């Protein structure tokens, strides 16, 4: 469908970024700029969003990540093909959850002002142009998701 | 049902342990005794198990956690009523996933030999009596879950 088509485009444009991330780093376990109770507010919104998702879409998303784990290289990076299946599944998951519950997650993360520190720190460890191209691609992808909603 | 009743008992018996854990600690973000790709391999088993759960059971589990998040005290401990609903929902989730996929998660974590370091460390920060009461209650609870499969 159109989400599937958009997933192909998103995946191919954002794969360079995905390959550059250090998947072995322990940094992702903690958000140092927030206390745990602040992080839990965003976790709450993601739990609410997930509970709003179609079971069929969630199960497809789970299977796609299971396969993706199976195809990782020595650096932890799954294949483009399995990345595309992940993005297609997540697109269908987000579609089923609806806009308000998805925006509630953004809004909860906005309370961390990640653009000041975490965002630029993460970008500094990858190719900036590749990160920008992934974001441009995400902005197009989200339009197909919203069209489905 | 039988899982509901077993959850009421398990929750009351394990609430002392639950209250004693330091929910504000960052220690849970990392497992120091395994590489991240070894942890990912155990996460694979949990993804598979979650994909096997009935969709409505999983949904009920998420709604129970959302409610629990709204009742946490200053130390992060949810109310016993909400903990009980969590355990009843998780019990139905596990029952729907089945025994083999649940044991596959156990066996993955058994690879980490947690009883040699992590288990003792976690138990040292709480009351060992209450941790053991929680574990014995868990062994009774799992009998009702298995009986439902
Ligand atoms: C499985 C789910 C797990 C976690 C969910 C996490 C993240 C996804 C959820 C939400 C999105 C995240 C943040 C958005 C919120 C606020 C905006 C912001 O921040 O904005 C900052 C920045 C983006 O900046 C934006 O950047 C763009 C740049 O694009 C512009 O400029 C471009 C040029 O580059 C182009 O011209 C383009 O056309 C134009 O629009 C604009 O300037 C926007 O105005 C500006 O806001 O985002 C950033 O920093 C991105 C930082 C993301 C870091 C990742 C994770 C955070 C840490 C922990 C997660 C928490 C818990 C763990 C989970 C579970 C526990 C076990
Ligand atoms: C949402 C899900 C998230 C994470 C999943 C985590 C946990 C759930 C999954 C599996 C269960 C975990 C471990 C079990 C595996 C092997 C057994 C073991 O290890 O055994 C050791 C010990 C218990 O030992 C057992 O203890 C009992 C004690 O029983 C005796 O003593 C009792 C006294 O209470 C009774 O009298 C009883 O009758 C008597 O037999 C026996 O001695 C057994 O022989 C002995 O094996 O357990 C321990 O230490 C257990 C330590 C638990 C530590 C917690 C987490 C693990 C670490 C990281 C999480 C990873 C990733 C997070 C995910 C995502 C990131 C975003
Ligand atoms: C198996 C392990 C595993 C791992 C390591 C991850 C890791 C991640 N997941 Mg996935 N997830 C998994 C399993 C996993 N997930 C499973 C089993 C499910 C259920 C089926 C999901 C469902 C899920 C959802 C629904 C979402 C995630 C998202 C994310 C990312 C959140 C942080 C972020 O935005 O970074 C940066 C993101 C990436 C590196 C991913 C690829 C690039 C994207 C598409 C564009 C990035 C644009 C820009 C550069 C950064 C974002 C800024 C902007 C949003 C403000 C992170 C890379 C979230 C995400 O990516 O939000 C954007 C998200 O929405 N995951
Ligand atoms: C909102 C945030 C949040 C937080 C912080 C947690 C945190 C936890 N979850 Mg929950 N989870 C959540 C949301 C959350 N979850 C959501 C939204 C879902 C989906 C609906 C789940 C679904 C889920 C499942 C399916 C399971 C967990 C489990 C766990 C625990 C894993 C580590 C462990 O065993 O510690 C120790 C455990 C506790 C402190 C829990 C209470 C006491 C238990 C019942 C007995 C403990 C016995 C013994 C002392 C220790 C374990 C020994 C082992 C051999 C069994 C941990 C306490 C796992 C777990 O507890 O396995 C044992 C588990 O099986 N969670
Ligand atoms: C049981 C089970 O399996 O659950 C499964 C549940 C899911 C949801 C399916 C699942 C998943 C997805 C998950 C969790 C995604 C998580 C994404 C987290 C991203 C975190 C990021 C980017 C964190 C940081 C931290 C940073 C810190 C930077 C700094 O501190 C540094 C260094 C130095 C300081 O001086 C300055 C600083 C700038 C402050 C940073 O820059 O970024 C998974 C894994 O499958 C597990
Ligand atoms: C039942 C149960 O337990 O379910 C489990 C199910 C899972 C899946 C395993 C699970 C999980 C993970 C989940 C849900 C993750 C969710 C992630 C959500 C990410 C949301 C994002 C990125 C949203 C946005 C919104 C944006 C908006 C941007 C703009 O609008 C802004 C501001 C202004 C406009 O002018 C321009 C704009 C640019 C348009 C944006 O940029 O990004 C969990 C938690 O474990 C629960
Ligand atoms: C440790 C380790 O090795 O881990 C390995 C684990 C794996 C899994 C094997 C692996 C991998 C692959 C990974 C992580 C892929 C991640 C993909 C993430 C995709 C996320 C997507 C698409 C999210 C969204 C959010 C959306 C929101 C859209 C909206 O809100 C927006 C904006 C604005 C609203 O107005 C309308 C809206 C429509 C509501 C959307 O449309 O899409 C890897 C790389 O190998 C690493
Ligand atoms: C108990 C235990 O051990 O659990 C283990 C479990 C695991 C799964 C094995 C595990 C793990 C792995 C995990 C979660 C990995 C998650 C990775 C997430 C990476 C996120 C990245 C890169 C985020 C960003 C955001 C960026 C933003 C860039 C921009 O916004 C910037 C700045 C400015 C804009 O103008 C342009 C822009 C381009 C938009 C960027 O460039 O990058 C871990 C940690 O080992 C713990
Ligand atoms: C996007 C999103 O929201 O995803 C949601 C996805 C879910 C699944 C729904 C979700 C959830 C649940 C999760 C992840 C549960 C995770 C549990 C993790 C438990 C980890 C433990 C016990 C870790 C450790 C580490 C230890 C270290 C011990 C030692 O090093 C110490 C200190 C010092 C030395 O002495 C040596 C040592 C002894 C070795 C230890 O002793 O224990 C959540 C939160 O809702 C988020
Ligand atoms: C589709 C989708 O969205 O899925 C998502 C859904 C979620 C839920 C959000 C999600 C998640 C988290 C998941 C699945 C967590 C799973 C946890 C599993 C825990 C399992 C446990 C404790 C199992 C066991 C087994 C044991 C056995 C013990 C014994 O047998 C032993 C050895 C020997 C006998 O002589 C005695 C015995 C005492 C009998 C034990 O002691 O413990 C994920 C990953 O995000 C995917
Ligand atoms: C950071 C922070 O503040 O977080 C806050 C977040 C919250 C959510 C609000 C909060 C809370 C509450 C929490 C964490 C509750 C956690 C509960 C976990 C319960 C887990 C259960 C029941 C797991 C299982 C596994 C089972 C497996 C059973 C079997 O395998 C067994 C053995 C043997 C096989 O032969 C048969 C089998 C039958 C297959 C089972 O039967 O059950 C708190 C405390 O407030 C903290
Ligand atoms: C990006 C970011 O910031 O994400 C943040 C997201 C969150 C959600 C806010 C977050 C968090 C909170 C999390 C996951 C909390 C998880 C807590 C887990 C606690 C586990 C405990 C206590 C485990 C145990 C196991 C024990 C074992 C005991 C025994 O086996 C022992 C030894 C010996 C046997 O004979 C008897 C026994 C009795 C059986 C014990 O006694 O205790 C965090 C970390 O802030 C990160
Ligand atoms: Cl509400
Ligand atoms: K592709
Ligand atoms: K003690």
């Amino acid at each position: 469908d159109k989400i599937d088509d958009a997933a192909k485009k998103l995946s191919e444009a954002s794969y360079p970024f995905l390959k550059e991330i250090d998947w072995s780093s322990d940094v992702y376990g903690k958000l140092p700029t927030a206390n745990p109770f602040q992080v839990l507010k965003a976790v709450d919104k993601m739990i609410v969003m997930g509970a709003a998702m179609d079971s069929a879409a969630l199960k497809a998303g789970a299977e796609a990540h299971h396969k993706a784990i199976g195809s990782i290289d020595a650096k932890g990076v799954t294949t483009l093909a399995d990345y595309e299946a992940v993005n297609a599944a997540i697109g269908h998951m987000v579609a089923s959850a609806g806009e308000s519950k998805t925006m509630d997650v953004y809004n909860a993360f906005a309370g961390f002002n990640l653009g000041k520190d975490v965002g630029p720190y993460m970008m500094s460890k990858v190719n900036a142009a590749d990160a920008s191209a992934a974001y441009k691609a995400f902005l197009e992808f989200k339009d197909a998701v919203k069209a489905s909603q």
Side-chain angles (χ1 to χ4, degrees), chain A residues 10 14 17-18 21 23 49 53 57-58 60-63 65-66 69 83 86-87 90 93-94 106 130-132 134-135 138:
Chain A
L10 170 66
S14 63
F17 173 64
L18 197 84
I21 295 169
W23 295 102
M49 195 181 156
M53 292 175 173
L58 273 173
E63 175 62 13
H65 289 82
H66 164 62
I69 293 171
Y83 184 45
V86 158
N87 284 332
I90 290 169
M93 284 154 58
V94 174
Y106 176 96
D130 291 334
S132 292
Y135 182 66
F138 173 81

mmCIF file of all heavy atoms in Angstrom, chain A residues 10 14 17-18 21 23 49 53 57-58 60-63 65-66 69 83 86-87 90 93-94 106 130-132 134-135 138, ligand 3:
data_model
loop_
_atom_site.group_PDB
_atom_site.id
_atom_site.type_symbol
_atom_site.label_atom_id
_atom_site.label_comp_id
_atom_site.label_asym_id
_atom_site.label_seq_id
_atom_site.Cartn_x
_atom_site.Cartn_y
_atom_site.Cartn_z
ATOM 1 N N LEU A 10 11.637 5.850 2.699
ATOM 2 C CA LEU A 10 12.225 6.269 3.953
ATOM 3 C C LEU A 10 13.458 5.445 4.265
ATOM 4 O O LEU A 10 14.480 5.967 4.729
ATOM 5 C CB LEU A 10 11.208 6.098 5.081
ATOM 6 C CG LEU A 10 11.756 6.265 6.480
ATOM 7 C CD1 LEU A 10 12.203 7.678 6.680
ATOM 8 C CD2 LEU A 10 10.737 5.897 7.497
ATOM 9 N N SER A 14 17.319 6.847 4.683
ATOM 10 C CA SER A 14 17.774 6.951 6.059
ATOM 11 C C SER A 14 18.739 5.851 6.473
ATOM 12 O O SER A 14 19.293 5.928 7.566
ATOM 13 C CB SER A 14 16.570 6.974 7.000
ATOM 14 O OG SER A 14 15.840 5.781 6.934
ATOM 15 N N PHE A 17 22.400 6.906 7.775
ATOM 16 C CA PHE A 17 22.326 7.286 9.185
ATOM 17 C C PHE A 17 22.259 6.058 10.090
ATOM 18 O O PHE A 17 23.006 5.952 11.061
ATOM 19 C CB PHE A 17 21.076 8.169 9.338
ATOM 20 C CG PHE A 17 20.703 8.557 10.743
ATOM 21 C CD1 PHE A 17 21.515 9.332 11.503
ATOM 22 C CD2 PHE A 17 19.496 8.215 11.244
ATOM 23 C CE1 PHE A 17 21.124 9.722 12.763
ATOM 24 C CE2 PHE A 17 19.125 8.584 12.504
ATOM 25 C CZ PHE A 17 19.937 9.342 13.254
ATOM 26 N N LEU A 18 21.374 5.124 9.790
ATOM 27 C CA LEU A 18 21.234 3.953 10.641
ATOM 28 C C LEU A 18 22.548 3.196 10.781
ATOM 29 O O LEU A 18 22.895 2.730 11.866
ATOM 30 C CB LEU A 18 20.152 3.044 10.084
ATOM 31 C CG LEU A 18 19.620 1.997 11.061
ATOM 32 C CD1 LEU A 18 18.550 2.562 11.944
ATOM 33 C CD2 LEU A 18 19.101 0.810 10.302
ATOM 34 N N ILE A 21 25.256 4.809 13.385
ATOM 35 C CA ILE A 21 25.017 4.849 14.812
ATOM 36 C C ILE A 21 25.806 3.741 15.477
ATOM 37 O O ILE A 21 25.892 2.634 14.961
ATOM 38 C CB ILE A 21 23.505 4.733 15.054
ATOM 39 C CG1 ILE A 21 22.795 5.967 14.466
ATOM 40 C CG2 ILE A 21 23.218 4.535 16.536
ATOM 41 C CD1 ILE A 21 21.298 5.863 14.398
ATOM 42 N N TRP A 23 25.748 1.076 17.693
ATOM 43 C CA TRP A 23 24.713 0.279 18.323
ATOM 44 C C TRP A 23 25.219 -0.456 19.545
ATOM 45 O O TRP A 23 24.404 -0.977 20.305
ATOM 46 C CB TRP A 23 24.088 -0.660 17.279
ATOM 47 C CG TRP A 23 23.383 0.107 16.218
ATOM 48 C CD1 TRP A 23 23.822 0.377 14.968
ATOM 49 C CD2 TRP A 23 22.111 0.747 16.329
ATOM 50 N NE1 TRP A 23 22.910 1.141 14.291
ATOM 51 C CE2 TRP A 23 21.847 1.379 15.104
ATOM 52 C CE3 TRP A 23 21.158 0.841 17.355
ATOM 53 C CZ2 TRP A 23 20.684 2.093 14.875
ATOM 54 C CZ3 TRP A 23 20.005 1.545 17.127
ATOM 55 C CH2 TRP A 23 19.778 2.169 15.903
ATOM 56 N N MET A 49 -0.008 4.993 23.677
ATOM 57 C CA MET A 49 -0.009 4.885 22.227
ATOM 58 C C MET A 49 -0.005 3.428 21.794
ATOM 59 O O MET A 49 -0.684 3.056 20.846
ATOM 60 C CB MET A 49 1.263 5.546 21.679
ATOM 61 C CG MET A 49 1.237 5.824 20.216
ATOM 62 S SD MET A 49 2.773 6.561 19.666
ATOM 63 C CE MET A 49 2.789 6.134 17.964
ATOM 64 N N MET A 53 -2.758 0.759 19.513
ATOM 65 C CA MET A 53 -2.401 0.180 18.232
ATOM 66 C C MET A 53 -3.187 -1.093 17.943
ATOM 67 O O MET A 53 -3.567 -1.836 18.846
ATOM 68 C CB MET A 53 -0.923 -0.152 18.208
ATOM 69 C CG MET A 53 -0.015 1.061 18.214
ATOM 70 S SD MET A 53 1.730 0.634 18.337
ATOM 71 C CE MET A 53 2.464 2.210 18.104
ATOM 72 N N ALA A 57 -1.144 -5.014 13.701
ATOM 73 C CA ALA A 57 0.002 -4.203 13.333
ATOM 74 C C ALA A 57 1.147 -4.385 14.314
ATOM 75 O O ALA A 57 2.300 -4.443 13.916
ATOM 76 C CB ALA A 57 -0.410 -2.738 13.279
ATOM 77 N N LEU A 58 0.836 -4.464 15.600
ATOM 78 C CA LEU A 58 1.857 -4.681 16.605
ATOM 79 C C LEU A 58 2.566 -6.003 16.386
ATOM 80 O O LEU A 58 3.787 -6.075 16.480
ATOM 81 C CB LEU A 58 1.222 -4.657 17.988
ATOM 82 C CG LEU A 58 1.065 -3.335 18.672
ATOM 83 C CD1 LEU A 58 0.270 -3.532 19.912
ATOM 84 C CD2 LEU A 58 2.415 -2.752 18.976
ATOM 85 N N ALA A 60 2.886 -7.692 13.605
ATOM 86 C CA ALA A 60 3.732 -7.554 12.429
ATOM 87 C C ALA A 60 4.995 -6.773 12.747
ATOM 88 O O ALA A 60 6.071 -7.109 12.257
ATOM 89 C CB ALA A 60 2.964 -6.884 11.295
ATOM 90 N N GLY A 61 4.880 -5.724 13.560
ATOM 91 C CA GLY A 61 6.051 -4.987 13.968
ATOM 92 C C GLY A 61 7.013 -5.818 14.791
ATOM 93 O O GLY A 61 8.223 -5.727 14.628
ATOM 94 N N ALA A 62 6.482 -6.630 15.698
ATOM 95 C CA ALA A 62 7.326 -7.504 16.504
ATOM 96 C C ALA A 62 8.061 -8.513 15.639
ATOM 97 O O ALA A 62 9.268 -8.683 15.776
ATOM 98 C CB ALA A 62 6.486 -8.215 17.580
ATOM 99 N N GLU A 63 7.344 -9.170 14.723
ATOM 100 C CA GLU A 63 7.981 -10.133 13.838
ATOM 101 C C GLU A 63 9.046 -9.478 12.987
ATOM 102 O O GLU A 63 10.095 -10.060 12.758
ATOM 103 C CB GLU A 63 6.946 -10.778 12.949
ATOM 104 C CG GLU A 63 7.492 -11.721 11.889
ATOM 105 C CD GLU A 63 8.229 -12.947 12.410
ATOM 106 O OE1 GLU A 63 8.145 -13.259 13.594
ATOM 107 O OE2 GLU A 63 8.870 -13.608 11.592
ATOM 108 N N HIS A 65 10.959 -6.919 13.733
ATOM 109 C CA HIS A 65 12.159 -6.695 14.523
ATOM 110 C C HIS A 65 12.856 -8.013 14.864
ATOM 111 O O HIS A 65 14.075 -8.074 14.900
ATOM 112 C CB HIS A 65 11.840 -5.896 15.790
ATOM 113 C CG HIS A 65 11.509 -4.447 15.542
ATOM 114 N ND1 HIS A 65 10.263 -4.020 15.153
ATOM 115 C CD2 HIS A 65 12.270 -3.337 15.642
ATOM 116 C CE1 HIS A 65 10.275 -2.707 15.028
ATOM 117 N NE2 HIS A 65 11.481 -2.271 15.309
ATOM 118 N N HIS A 66 12.098 -9.067 15.085
ATOM 119 C CA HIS A 66 12.689 -10.388 15.285
ATOM 120 C C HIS A 66 13.539 -10.791 14.085
ATOM 121 O O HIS A 66 14.679 -11.219 14.235
ATOM 122 C CB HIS A 66 11.572 -11.409 15.558
ATOM 123 C CG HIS A 66 11.989 -12.842 15.403
ATOM 124 N ND1 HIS A 66 12.966 -13.423 16.178
ATOM 125 C CD2 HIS A 66 11.550 -13.808 14.575
ATOM 126 C CE1 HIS A 66 13.119 -14.677 15.815
ATOM 127 N NE2 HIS A 66 12.281 -14.930 14.835
ATOM 128 N N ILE A 69 16.765 -8.574 13.891
ATOM 129 C CA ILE A 69 17.824 -9.023 14.773
ATOM 130 C C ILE A 69 18.598 -10.171 14.129
ATOM 131 O O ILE A 69 19.815 -10.284 14.288
ATOM 132 C CB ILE A 69 17.252 -9.424 16.150
ATOM 133 C CG1 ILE A 69 16.706 -8.192 16.866
ATOM 134 C CG2 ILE A 69 18.298 -10.108 16.969
ATOM 135 C CD1 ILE A 69 15.937 -8.498 18.104
ATOM 136 N N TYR A 83 15.251 -3.547 7.545
ATOM 137 C CA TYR A 83 14.926 -2.177 7.940
ATOM 138 C C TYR A 83 13.648 -1.686 7.268
ATOM 139 O O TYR A 83 12.810 -1.063 7.908
ATOM 140 C CB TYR A 83 16.136 -1.290 7.636
ATOM 141 C CG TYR A 83 16.031 0.165 8.057
ATOM 142 C CD1 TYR A 83 15.537 0.526 9.300
ATOM 143 C CD2 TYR A 83 16.446 1.167 7.212
ATOM 144 C CE1 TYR A 83 15.453 1.837 9.658
ATOM 145 C CE2 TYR A 83 16.379 2.473 7.566
ATOM 146 C CZ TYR A 83 15.885 2.815 8.784
ATOM 147 O OH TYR A 83 15.801 4.137 9.125
ATOM 148 N N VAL A 86 10.638 -3.211 8.912
ATOM 149 C CA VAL A 86 10.426 -2.564 10.200
ATOM 150 C C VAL A 86 9.707 -1.244 10.012
ATOM 151 O O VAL A 86 8.722 -0.964 10.689
ATOM 152 C CB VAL A 86 11.773 -2.382 10.925
ATOM 153 C CG1 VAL A 86 11.675 -1.289 11.953
ATOM 154 C CG2 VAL A 86 12.228 -3.698 11.539
ATOM 155 N N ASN A 87 10.177 -0.418 9.083
ATOM 156 C CA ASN A 87 9.549 0.875 8.877
ATOM 157 C C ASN A 87 8.128 0.737 8.356
ATOM 158 O O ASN A 87 7.238 1.483 8.769
ATOM 159 C CB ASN A 87 10.377 1.720 7.936
ATOM 160 C CG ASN A 87 11.587 2.297 8.591
ATOM 161 O OD1 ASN A 87 11.599 2.526 9.799
ATOM 162 N ND2 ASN A 87 12.606 2.548 7.803
ATOM 163 N N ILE A 90 6.052 -0.260 11.453
ATOM 164 C CA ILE A 90 5.874 0.867 12.358
ATOM 165 C C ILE A 90 4.914 1.889 11.759
ATOM 166 O O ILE A 90 4.068 2.435 12.464
ATOM 167 C CB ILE A 90 7.220 1.498 12.738
ATOM 168 C CG1 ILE A 90 8.007 0.567 13.627
ATOM 169 C CG2 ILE A 90 7.003 2.789 13.462
ATOM 170 C CD1 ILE A 90 9.422 0.969 13.853
ATOM 171 N N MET A 93 1.607 0.575 12.419
ATOM 172 C CA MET A 93 1.334 0.740 13.837
ATOM 173 C C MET A 93 0.930 2.167 14.175
ATOM 174 O O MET A 93 -0.072 2.387 14.856
ATOM 175 C CB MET A 93 2.542 0.352 14.679
ATOM 176 C CG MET A 93 2.768 -1.135 14.797
ATOM 177 S SD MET A 93 4.466 -1.605 15.112
ATOM 178 C CE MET A 93 4.834 -0.755 16.602
ATOM 179 N N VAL A 94 1.723 3.145 13.741
ATOM 180 C CA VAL A 94 1.439 4.549 14.028
ATOM 181 C C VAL A 94 0.113 4.961 13.413
ATOM 182 O O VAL A 94 -0.657 5.698 14.017
ATOM 183 C CB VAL A 94 2.594 5.452 13.545
ATOM 184 C CG1 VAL A 94 2.236 6.906 13.721
ATOM 185 C CG2 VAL A 94 3.837 5.117 14.276
ATOM 186 N N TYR A 106 5.438 12.938 21.140
ATOM 187 C CA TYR A 106 6.262 14.085 20.794
ATOM 188 C C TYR A 106 6.192 15.140 21.890
ATOM 189 O O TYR A 106 7.211 15.631 22.348
ATOM 190 C CB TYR A 106 5.812 14.696 19.467
ATOM 191 C CG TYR A 106 6.566 15.956 19.094
ATOM 192 C CD1 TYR A 106 7.646 15.914 18.249
ATOM 193 C CD2 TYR A 106 6.195 17.188 19.602
ATOM 194 C CE1 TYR A 106 8.340 17.056 17.924
ATOM 195 C CE2 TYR A 106 6.886 18.324 19.283
ATOM 196 C CZ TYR A 106 7.968 18.256 18.445
ATOM 197 O OH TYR A 106 8.667 19.395 18.125
ATOM 198 N N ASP A 130 23.848 12.916 6.505
ATOM 199 C CA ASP A 130 23.049 11.700 6.498
ATOM 200 C C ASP A 130 21.927 11.770 7.525
ATOM 201 O O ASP A 130 20.814 11.326 7.252
ATOM 202 C CB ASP A 130 23.941 10.493 6.718
ATOM 203 C CG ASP A 130 24.866 10.216 5.549
ATOM 204 O OD1 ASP A 130 24.541 10.586 4.415
ATOM 205 O OD2 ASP A 130 25.893 9.609 5.773
ATOM 206 N N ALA A 131 22.199 12.350 8.693
ATOM 207 C CA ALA A 131 21.142 12.587 9.674
ATOM 208 C C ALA A 131 20.066 13.537 9.143
ATOM 209 O O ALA A 131 18.873 13.295 9.321
ATOM 210 C CB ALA A 131 21.754 13.152 10.952
ATOM 211 N N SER A 132 20.480 14.624 8.478
ATOM 212 C CA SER A 132 19.526 15.546 7.891
ATOM 213 C C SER A 132 18.684 14.872 6.825
ATOM 214 O O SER A 132 17.486 15.125 6.726
ATOM 215 C CB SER A 132 20.258 16.744 7.299
ATOM 216 O OG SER A 132 20.832 17.531 8.307
ATOM 217 N N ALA A 134 17.895 11.706 6.627
ATOM 218 C CA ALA A 134 16.950 10.821 7.303
ATOM 219 C C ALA A 134 15.753 11.600 7.810
ATOM 220 O O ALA A 134 14.629 11.145 7.704
ATOM 221 C CB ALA A 134 17.654 10.119 8.457
ATOM 222 N N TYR A 135 15.987 12.789 8.347
ATOM 223 C CA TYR A 135 14.901 13.608 8.846
ATOM 224 C C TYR A 135 14.030 14.137 7.721
ATOM 225 O O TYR A 135 12.806 14.152 7.843
ATOM 226 C CB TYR A 135 15.451 14.758 9.688
ATOM 227 C CG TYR A 135 14.369 15.620 10.262
ATOM 228 C CD1 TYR A 135 13.486 15.119 11.195
ATOM 229 C CD2 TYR A 135 14.207 16.932 9.852
ATOM 230 C CE1 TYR A 135 12.488 15.893 11.702
ATOM 231 C CE2 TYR A 135 13.196 17.720 10.358
ATOM 232 C CZ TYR A 135 12.350 17.204 11.286
ATOM 233 O OH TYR A 135 11.354 17.974 11.797
ATOM 234 N N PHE A 138 11.949 11.264 6.840
ATOM 235 C CA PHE A 138 10.919 11.045 7.844
ATOM 236 C C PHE A 138 9.749 11.994 7.638
ATOM 237 O O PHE A 138 8.600 11.592 7.737
ATOM 238 C CB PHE A 138 11.541 11.219 9.229
ATOM 239 C CG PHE A 138 10.551 11.194 10.355
ATOM 240 C CD1 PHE A 138 10.072 9.994 10.848
ATOM 241 C CD2 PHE A 138 10.102 12.359 10.913
ATOM 242 C CE1 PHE A 138 9.164 9.974 11.879
ATOM 243 C CE2 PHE A 138 9.198 12.332 11.933
ATOM 244 C CZ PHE A 138 8.729 11.131 12.413
HETATM 245 C C1 LIG C 3 15.099 -4.646 18.871
HETATM 246 C C2 LIG C 3 15.564 -3.561 19.436
HETATM 247 C C3 LIG C 3 15.156 -2.213 19.145
HETATM 248 C C4 LIG C 3 15.947 -1.097 19.153
HETATM 249 C C5 LIG C 3 17.357 -0.977 19.463
HETATM 250 C C6 LIG C 3 15.064 0.053 18.820
HETATM 251 C C7 LIG C 3 15.517 1.378 18.744
HETATM 252 C C8 LIG C 3 14.760 2.482 18.389
HETATM 253 N N1 LIG C 3 13.449 2.522 18.068
HETATM 254 MG MG1 LIG C 3 12.280 0.728 17.755
HETATM 255 N N2 LIG C 3 10.942 -0.848 18.267
HETATM 256 C C9 LIG C 3 11.352 -2.115 18.545
HETATM 257 C C10 LIG C 3 12.671 -2.547 18.798
HETATM 258 C C11 LIG C 3 13.772 -1.772 18.825
HETATM 259 N N3 LIG C 3 13.793 -0.376 18.617
HETATM 260 C C12 LIG C 3 10.205 -2.998 18.583
HETATM 261 C C13 LIG C 3 10.254 -4.439 18.886
HETATM 262 C C14 LIG C 3 9.096 -2.214 18.342
HETATM 263 C C15 LIG C 3 7.691 -2.649 18.289
HETATM 264 C C16 LIG C 3 7.338 -3.310 16.995
HETATM 265 C C17 LIG C 3 9.566 -0.872 18.133
HETATM 266 C C18 LIG C 3 8.759 0.235 17.861
HETATM 267 C C19 LIG C 3 9.216 1.530 17.694
HETATM 268 C C20 LIG C 3 8.436 2.753 17.389
HETATM 269 C C21 LIG C 3 6.987 2.780 17.182
HETATM 270 C C22 LIG C 3 9.362 3.770 17.314
HETATM 271 C C23 LIG C 3 10.661 3.198 17.584
HETATM 272 C C24 LIG C 3 11.725 4.156 17.602
HETATM 273 C C25 LIG C 3 13.039 3.833 17.891
HETATM 274 C C26 LIG C 3 14.208 4.781 18.072
HETATM 275 C C27 LIG C 3 13.941 5.767 19.201
HETATM 276 C C28 LIG C 3 15.032 6.804 19.338
HETATM 277 C C29 LIG C 3 15.123 7.656 18.110
HETATM 278 O O1 LIG C 3 14.257 8.338 17.626
HETATM 279 O O2 LIG C 3 16.326 7.572 17.501
HETATM 280 C C30 LIG C 3 16.478 8.014 16.134
HETATM 281 C C31 LIG C 3 15.779 7.078 15.213
HETATM 282 C C32 LIG C 3 16.339 6.119 14.464
HETATM 283 C C33 LIG C 3 17.797 5.828 14.434
HETATM 284 C C34 LIG C 3 15.474 5.256 13.604
HETATM 285 C C35 LIG C 3 15.683 5.409 12.101
HETATM 286 C C36 LIG C 3 15.581 6.854 11.590
HETATM 287 C C37 LIG C 3 14.222 7.531 11.722
HETATM 288 C C38 LIG C 3 13.187 6.818 10.899
HETATM 289 C C39 LIG C 3 14.281 9.009 11.338
HETATM 290 C C40 LIG C 3 15.144 9.833 12.262
HETATM 291 C C41 LIG C 3 15.058 11.323 12.004
HETATM 292 C C42 LIG C 3 15.997 12.142 12.871
HETATM 293 C C43 LIG C 3 17.432 11.962 12.422
HETATM 294 C C44 LIG C 3 15.906 11.829 14.361
HETATM 295 C C45 LIG C 3 14.525 11.965 14.943
HETATM 296 C C46 LIG C 3 14.137 13.405 15.179
HETATM 297 C C47 LIG C 3 12.660 13.753 15.093
HETATM 298 C C48 LIG C 3 11.712 12.609 15.322
HETATM 299 C C49 LIG C 3 12.285 14.879 16.019
HETATM 300 C C50 LIG C 3 15.420 3.864 18.376
HETATM 301 C C51 LIG C 3 16.568 3.939 17.381
HETATM 302 C C52 LIG C 3 11.054 5.477 17.389
HETATM 303 C C53 LIG C 3 11.691 6.347 16.344
HETATM 304 O O3 LIG C 3 12.542 6.092 15.532
HETATM 305 O O4 LIG C 3 11.189 7.590 16.389
HETATM 306 C C54 LIG C 3 11.601 8.453 15.362
HETATM 307 C C55 LIG C 3 9.572 5.162 17.087
HETATM 308 O O5 LIG C 3 8.778 5.992 16.707
HETATM 309 N N4 LIG C 3 10.585 1.873 17.741
#
